[PDB]
Amino acid sequence: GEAPNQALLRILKETEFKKIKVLGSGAGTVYKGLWIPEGEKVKIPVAIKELRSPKANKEILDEAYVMASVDNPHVCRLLGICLTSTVQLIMQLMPFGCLLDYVREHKDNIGSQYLLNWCVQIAKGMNYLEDRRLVHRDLAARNVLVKTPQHVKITDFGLKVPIKWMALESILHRIYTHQSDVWSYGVTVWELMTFGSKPYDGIPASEISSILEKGERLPQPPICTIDVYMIMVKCWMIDADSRPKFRELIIEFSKMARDPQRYLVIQGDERMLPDMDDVVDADEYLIP
Numbered sequence: 001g002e003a004p005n006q007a008l009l010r011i012l013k014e015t016e017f018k019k020i021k022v023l024g025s026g027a028g029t030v031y032k033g034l035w036i037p038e039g040e041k042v043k044i045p046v047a048i049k050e051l052r053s054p055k056a057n058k059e060i061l062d063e064a065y066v067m068a069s070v071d072n073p074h075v076c077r078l079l080g081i082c083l084t085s086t087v088q089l090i091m092q093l094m095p096f097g098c099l100l101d102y103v104r105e106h107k108d109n110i111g112s113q114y115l116l117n118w119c120v121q122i123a124k125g126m127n128y129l130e131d132r133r134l135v136h137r138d139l140a141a142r143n144v145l146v147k148t149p150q151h152v153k154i155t156d157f158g159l160k161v162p163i164k165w166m167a168l169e170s171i172l173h174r175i176y177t178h179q180s181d182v183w184s185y186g187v188t189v190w191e192l193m194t195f196g197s198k199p200y201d202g203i204p205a206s207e208i209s210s211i212l213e214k215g216e217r218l219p220q221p222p223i224c225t226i227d228v229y230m231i232m233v234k235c236w237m238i239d240a241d242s243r244p245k246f247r248e249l250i251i252e253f254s255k256m257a258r259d260p261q262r263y264l265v266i267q268g269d270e271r272m273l274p275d276m277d278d279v280v281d282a283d284e285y286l287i288p
C-alpha cells in the first residue's frame with residue numbers, strides 16, 4: 001500500500017524564462033537558459049528541453065513526472081514544465097556536463113579525493129531512490145551530471161539497451177531491482193577509476209551475457225587498490241542478495257574518502273579543479 005505522491009508540479013510561462021544558448025541539439029534540443037520567476041527579483045540558471053506533435057509527449061511527460069517527485073541533494077530536480085505548443089521541460093543547470101565527459105577531459109587533473117567523493121554522492125543519490133522505492137534502471141557515468149567538480153547529481157531515473165551496464169539477471173530475465181542498480185553502480189565506479197574508459201570494449205553485446213556466466217568481470221583499473229576493486233567486484237556477484245546495499249556503499253567509500261591516498265594511487269595526486277547580481281542557484285531557491 002503505497003503513500004500518495006503529493007509532489008507539486010509547476011507550470012511556467014514562456015515569458016518567465018529565456019534561452020541564452022543551446023547545450024545540445026537533436027531531432028529535442030536543450031538550451032542553457034535563465035528563469036526569472038514572476039515578481040521575485042531572482043534569476044535562476046536552467047536547462048530547457050524542447051521537442052520539435054510528436055506524440056512522444058507521453059515519454060517526456062512521464063520523465064517530468066518522475067523528476068518532480070524526487071528531492072535530494074544528489075538527485076537532479078525538475079523546476080517546472082511549460083505547456084507550449086511544443087512542451088518544454090525546465091530543470092536545474094549543471095554547467096560542467098555529464099561526469100563521463102568531465103572525467104575524460106580532465107583525467108590528467110583529477111585527484112583521488114574527487115573520485116572517492118563522487119562515488120559517495122552517487123551512492124547517496126541511489127540510496128535516496130531506494131528510499132523512494134524508485135529503481136533507476138540506467139545508472140552510468142553519462143547519467144551523472146556535474147553541478148560543480150565538488151557536487152554531482154544522478155539523472156535519467158525516469159525511463160539501444162545498455163547491456164554493458166546491466167546486471168546479469170536483467171540481461172537474461174528483464175529483471176530490474178535496486179540490487180541490479182548496485183551492479184550498474186559498480187560499472188559506473190569502474191568508469192570513473194578508468195577515467196572514462198569503455199567497459200568490455202571491442203566485445204559484442206551478445207557475447208557479454210555468457211562472459212558473465214563464466215565468471216569473467218571488468219579488469220582492475222591501475223589506480224585502484226584491491227580494497228576499492230574488491231568493492232566493485234562485490235557489486236558484480238550473480239546472487240543479488242550477496243551484492244552490497246547502497247547504504248553500505250556510502251559507508252565504505254566515506255571511510256576511504258578520509259584517507260584517499262591509501263585507496264587510490266594516482267601520479268602526482270597531491271598537486272592536482274575549477275547582470276549576474278540576482279543570480280541564485282536552484283538549490284537555494286525553494287518555494288513553500
Ligand SMILES: Cn1c2ccccc2c2c3c(c4c5ccccc5n(CCC#N)c4c21)CNC3=O
Nearest residue numbers: 023024030047049091092093094095096097098
Ligand atoms: C548535453 N548536455 C549538457 C552539456 C553541458 C552541460 C549541460 C548539459 C546538459 C544538461 C542536460 C541535458 C539533457 C537533458 C535531457 C536530455 C539531454 C540532455 N543533454 C544532452 C544529452 C547528451 N549528451 C543535456 C545536457 C540537462 N541539464 C544539463 O545541464
